[PDB]
Amino acid sequence: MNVVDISRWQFGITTVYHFIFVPLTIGLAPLIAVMQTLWVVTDNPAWYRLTKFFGKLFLINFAIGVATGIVQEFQFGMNWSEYSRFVGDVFGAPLAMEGLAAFFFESTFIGLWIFGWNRLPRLVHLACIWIVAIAVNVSAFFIIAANSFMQHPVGAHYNPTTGRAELSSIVVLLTNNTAQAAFTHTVSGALLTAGTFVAAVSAWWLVRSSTTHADSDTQAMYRPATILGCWVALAATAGLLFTGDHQGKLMFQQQPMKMASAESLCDTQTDPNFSVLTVLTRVIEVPYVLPFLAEGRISGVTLQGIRDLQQEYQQRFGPNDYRPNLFVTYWSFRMMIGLMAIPVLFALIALWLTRGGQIPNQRWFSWLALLTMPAPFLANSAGWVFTEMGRQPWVVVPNPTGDQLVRLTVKAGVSDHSATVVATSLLMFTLVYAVLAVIWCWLLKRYIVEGPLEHDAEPA
Amino acid sequence: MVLQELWFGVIAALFLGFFILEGFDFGVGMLMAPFAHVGMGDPETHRRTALNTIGPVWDGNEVWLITAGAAIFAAFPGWYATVFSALYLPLLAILFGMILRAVAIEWRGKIDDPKWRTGADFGIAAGSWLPALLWGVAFAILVRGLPVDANGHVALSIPDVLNAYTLLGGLATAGLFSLYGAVFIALKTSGPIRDDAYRFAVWLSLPVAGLVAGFGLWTQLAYGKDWTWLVLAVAGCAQAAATVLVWRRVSDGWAFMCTLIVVAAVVVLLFGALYPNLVPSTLNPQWSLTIHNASSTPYTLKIMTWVTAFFAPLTVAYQTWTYWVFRQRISAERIPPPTGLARRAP
Ligand SMILES: CCCCCCCCCCCCCC(=O)OC[C@H](COP(=O)(O)OCC(O)COP(=O)(O)OC[C@@H](COC(=O)CCCCCCCCCCCCC)OC(=O)CCCCCCCCCCCCC)OC(=O)CCCCCCCCCCCCC
Ligand SMILES: CC(C)=CCC/C(C)=C/CC/C(C)=C\CC/C(C)=C/CC/C(C)=C\CC/C(C)=C\CC/C(C)=C/CC/C(C)=C/CC/C(C)=C/CC1=C(C)C(=O)c2ccccc2C1=O
Ligand SMILES: CCCCCCCCCCCCCCCCCCCC(=O)O[C@H](COC(=O)CCCCCCCCCCCCCC)COP(=O)(O)OCCN
Ligand code: HDD
Ligand code: HEM
Ligand code: HEM
Numbered sequence A: 001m002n003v004v005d006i007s008r009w010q011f012g013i014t015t016v017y018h019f020i021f022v023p024l025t026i027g028l029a030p031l032i033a034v035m036q037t038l039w040v041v042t043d044n045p046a047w048y049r050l051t052k053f054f055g056k057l058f059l060i061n062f063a064i065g066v067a068t069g070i071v072q073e074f075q076f077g078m079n080w081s082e083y084s085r086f087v088g089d090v091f092g093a094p095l096a097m098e099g100l101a102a103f104f105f106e107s108t109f110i111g112l113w114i115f116g117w118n119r120l121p122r123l124v125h126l127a128c129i130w131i132v133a134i135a136v137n138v139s140a141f142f143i144i145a146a147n148s149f150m151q152h153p154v155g156a157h158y159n160p161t162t163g164r165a166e167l168s169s170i171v172v173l174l175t176n177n178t179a180q181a182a183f184t185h186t187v188s189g190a191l192l193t194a195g196t197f198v199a200a201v202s203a204w205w206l207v208r209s210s211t212t213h214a215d216s217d218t219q220a221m222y223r224p225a226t227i228l229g230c231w232v233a234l235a236a237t238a239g240l241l242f243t244g245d246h247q248g249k250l251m252f253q254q255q256p257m258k259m260a261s262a263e264s265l266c267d268t269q270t271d272p273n274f275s276v277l278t279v280l281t282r283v284i285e286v287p288y289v290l291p292f293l294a295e296g297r298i299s300g301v302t303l304q305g306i307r308d309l310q311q312e313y314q315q316r317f318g319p320n321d322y323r324p325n326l327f328v329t330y331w332s333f334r335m336m337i338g339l340m341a342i343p344v345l346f347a348l349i350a351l352w353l354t355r356g357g358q359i360p361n362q363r364w365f366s367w368l369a370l371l372t373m374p375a376p377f378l379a380n381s382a383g384w385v386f387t388e389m390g391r392q393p394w395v396v397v398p399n400p401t402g403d404q405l406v407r408l409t410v411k412a413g414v415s416d417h418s419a420t421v422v423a424t425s426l427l428m429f430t431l432v433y434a435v436l437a438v439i440w441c442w443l444l445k446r447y448i449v450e451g452p453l454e455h456d457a458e459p460a
Numbered sequence B: 001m002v003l004q005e006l007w008f009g010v011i012a013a014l015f016l017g018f019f020i021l022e023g024f025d026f027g028v029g030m031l032m033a034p035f036a037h038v039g040m041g042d043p044e045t046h047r048r049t050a051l052n053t054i055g056p057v058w059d060g061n062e063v064w065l066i067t068a069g070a071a072i073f074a075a076f077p078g079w080y081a082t083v084f085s086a087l088y089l090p091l092l093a094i095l096f097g098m099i100l101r102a103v104a105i106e107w108r109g110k111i112d113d114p115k116w117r118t119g120a121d122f123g124i125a126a127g128s129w130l131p132a133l134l135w136g137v138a139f140a141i142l143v144r145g146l147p148v149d150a151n152g153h154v155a156l157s158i159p160d161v162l163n164a165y166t167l168l169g170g171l172a173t174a175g176l177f178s179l180y181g182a183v184f185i186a187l188k189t190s191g192p193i194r195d196d197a198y199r200f201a202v203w204l205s206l207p208v209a210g211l212v213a214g215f216g217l218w219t220q221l222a223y224g225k226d227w228t229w230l231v232l233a234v235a236g237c238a239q240a241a242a243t244v245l246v247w248r249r250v251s252d253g254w255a256f257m258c259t260l261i262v263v264a265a266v267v268v269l270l271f272g273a274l275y276p277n278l279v280p281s282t283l284n285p286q287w288s289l290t291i292h293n294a295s296s297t298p299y300t301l302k303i304m305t306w307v308t309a310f311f312a313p314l315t316v317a318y319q320t321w322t323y324w325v326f327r328q329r330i331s332a333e334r335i336p337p338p339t340g341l342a343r344r345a346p
Helices: A003-018 A022-042 A045-079 A081-115 A122-151 A170-174 A177-211 A216-254 A256-262 A290-295 A306-316 A326-338 A341-353 A363-372 A374-389 A419-450 B002-038 B043-053 B058-075 B077-086 B088-110 B114-144 B164-188 B192-223 B228-247 B252-272 B298-325
Strands: A156-159 A164-167 A274-277 A283-286 A394-396 B277-279
Touching: A003 A045, A003 A374, A003 A419, A022 A045, A022 A122, A022 A177, A022 A216, A022 A374, A045 A081, A045 A177, A045 A216, A045 A419, A045 B058, A045 B077, A045 B088, A081 A122, A081 A164, A081 A170, A081 A394, A081 B058, A081 B077, A081 B298, A122 A170, A122 A177, A122 A394, A164 B298, A177 A216, A177 A341, A177 A363, A177 A374, A216 A256, A216 A290, A216 A341, A256 A306, A256 A326, A326 A374, A341 A363, A341 A374, A363 A374, A419 B088, B002 B043, B002 B058, B002 B114, B002 B164, B002 B192, B002 B252, B002 B298, B043 B088, B043 B114, B043 B164, B043 B192, B058 B077, B058 B088, B058 B298, B077 B088, B077 B277, B088 B114, B114 B164, B114 B192, B114 B252, B164 B192, B164 B228, B164 B252, B192 B228, B192 B252, B228 B252
Parallel strands: none
Antiparallel strands: A156 A164, A274 A283
16 A cells, blocks of 8 residues: 555545544534533533533543544644645635634633632633634634635635745635635534533433333433533534535536536436445435525426546546545435434433423333433534545646646645655554543543432532 | 745744743653552542543644644755655654644543553653654754755765753753643642642753753853844743742742743744754855745745734634633642553453
């Protein structure tokens, strides 16, 4: 395996590991802030217990979240030195702004929240978590904005003298269509993940308390948490559909190859049908979807084929294979779309059971709650895999309505490293991250099975 | 133009803050194991007391290195690409240590098990010994230079990384942080733990002075500038005062101050000796990277200046407030009993 493939695999593995924990933090921090402010406003002990309980899980997830994110900061230079030079002038500014704007805020104020429980006044301590809640959201915007430049490079021009992309206006870079649409979608995904996590943990504990460890105090505490999590999950899903529709609008007119990759269109077609299974065979097709995802119209659109775009791209740029990994993008898109059923289905059932003050006591409900926690994480991971592997030939996709010279293939963005040197790094990160992820899952299980701790039963 | 030198200094300032803050973070991590083996009473209480000094501020301090790397990427893409890709192997170990430390600190007390805590202790120790040693080595390489051809590649070799000068850089940085951490604990705690921290500083006071003086003097003689002599002079003067204070326990704050200046002086000394170039080329000075050819466009630097000019003052504004909030000394009698859960679920 050449160095390019190993570097791609290393980046993909080290980033997928990082984003297994990011969705929880981004979505959970607003939820914890909401619970804490509810406690402050209503001085209800129940909300205090939930904040301490879910606070521990949030801190456990936060620690590894920061640990996995450190590598990504340096990976660009380590493996993609050639690509860093090309986009560094314009790419670094969003990254540097994030460090000063978000990292310094969330990292500093998370420490205050953890240790300032009995030191800072309630009002100030409440603001600490809110600052973290805003900081994480801002962190997403700048980072997603940086990637959105690679997907749709605007606001920069190619300088032949230096042979690199140079910035022209930061306002244009931070307000391009992809950054807005991408950010408003990922945040919705993180909110869905956090809401599903809270609902599943709470609902599982509701059933547990009802059938075992019988205690009225604990069940009366979790029911509000279950309802809040379910409502957040439903609200996030409604946001995902709207943002998802918007993303389809841009993808069709920005990266036609990626759109033709979601549904593997061999040749250009009018009103293409959406097929769920392929081995092409096109098992169980679904019309009216692709045209709507393209321009929100049931009919009256032509989608360029994979083959048709190949000739056009070859003529426009040069001899090269511009076909992405059709299988991987196809199935990642299918999984990401199809994983909405679980959390949405779970939310509806959970709300119905808890209707009118009732408390569920069905064993199968606990199993459904447990089986639903993985689904948001897998869906979030699949989406990022699709958008990234959907532009496989390019690391900076050419802009159809921009500077055509602002483009870079992956092979030209990889650093000149020996295969052996990179291979050890891939093994080092894979094993370490796997062990840390296993320990993180075990810690979450251990803390969930314990629920409210005895020494967090009184705000004092 | 001016912006290039201004942002070179800013990047130097970010690293100056990183070592000023993370300097004692590593030192505390370095010294945890010695405290357990030397301190009286149960070992566990001393480890928790030492760790909790940096408990609320370690996360905020580490961001400086992340922000430093992002700033290097944004202002000097050429510096970012050439260096990090050239230092791939040394930087890999630093990343491994940082990864282990981040999870270990937060997860140490999550479970009550001697084997569990032993594993976390290794994560913190391995996450402080490696960054402390290698960051000294890494900056030694930059000052010494790397083999850079006309095109811009490196083609590094083992002698260019593990050289006598670079090794002295690692030992000096590791020793300096160890002393820096020892005085920090002596300022942040009270009771027998403070006495033990002072005892550690005494042992590290003289050996570190030889290393830092030797490392600083060597750099000043070889790659130093005319004005860098003052930076070395103040470092020697600061170290002399620092050593006296630890030996004669008259003030905890001043001892921390004098050691802090030494760390600051060392960082300024390296950058001062590295002002014009960013990656001096051993093969030929002409091909060496320079701020005047490896920097971003004027517009990018101008935009970045406004953001930093308003956020850097703000970041320092409330970062100091965080330290002020937790200024109260902690001691073995204020540490709450462990809250971890048994490994075997009942
Ligand atoms: C706005 C956002 C926030 C921002 C945060 C703060 C940002 C810091 C900005 C740093 C600006 C550096 C600008 C610079 O050095 O450009 C080269 C230029 C001379 O240009 P030239 O045309 O090439 O000169 C001709 C000739 O010299 C060339 O051949 P030669 O080899 O003989 O000379 C080259 C040397 C000249 O050195 C000098 O003459 C002055 C030496 C003193 C430099 C300042 C170090 C002391 C301040 C540190 C303690 C600071 C006070 C404790 O080239 C140099 O100038 C070496 C410059 C490298 C210095 C980097 C050291 C890191 C400093 C980090 C300080 C951070 C503190 C927070 O040198 C100058 O004479 C300009 C005057 C520099 C005075 C710096 C005063 C800033 C003090 C910082 C106050 C901190 C509180 C906010
Ligand atoms: C109603 C309801 C229907 C549900 C059904 C949904 C449905 C239809 C699902 C279809 C699923 C099927 C059949 C196949 C999936 C095909 C496929 C290739 C999917 C992509 C995988 C994906 C979306 C996510 C990865 C899973 C994940 C995040 C974690 C797994 C669990 C754990 C703890 C993993 C540890 C981390 C680990 C070992 C990661 C390695 C896997 C990764 C990150 C792969 C990404 C990746 C891939 C996949 C490349 O092919 C590749 C090629 C060249 C360079 C780079 C990469 C690269 O990075
Ligand atoms: C471990 C044992 C492996 C050795 C044993 C063989 C395994 C057989 C099964 C593999 C599939 C059959 C063989 C694949 C042929 C090469 C790759 C497909 C060709 C292709 O068009 O896509 C390429 C994907 O390459 C890539 O970058 C990806 C390489 C293919 C692996 C993709 C992984 C998909 C499955 C992911 C599972 C997820 C795990 C998480 C649970 C991109 O072609 P190009 O752009 O480079 O064109 C350059 C031309 N000059
Ligand atoms: C959509 C959100 C998002 C995306 C796509 C990423 N990140 Fe992330 N990152 C965060 C959202 C986030 C976060 C929410 O801000 C985290 C998670 C928990 C946390 O520590 O902050 C974080 C933490 C985090 C940290 C440590 C922050 C700290 O020290 O406190 C670094 C260095 C990175 N990230 C770097 C990256 C890099 C280089 C990425 C490259 C793709 C990346 N992240 C993708
Ligand atoms: C700001 C965020 C991100 C940036 C800047 C970014 C950038 C990159 C870069 C530079 C590569 C290497 C080039 C390449 O592989 O084609 C890459 C690949 C990849 N990224 Fe991302 N990425 C980001 C976020 C994510 C996230 C969050 C994930 C996964 C959750 C992810 C998954 C991948 C995968 C799997 C690859 C390998 C894909 C490929 O080989 O083409 N990325 N991305
Ligand atoms: C009908 C449902 C969905 C649609 C139409 C949809 C659509 C899309 C589209 C078009 C992309 C980006 C492709 C590109 O920009 O190149 C995308 C990406 C993504 N989707 Fe989805 N998606 C849906 C569901 C979900 C769900 C449920 C999640 C997460 C729980 C999610 C998470 C993501 C994520 C994280 C990305 C990351 C990349 C991005 O920022 O766009 N998706 N989705």
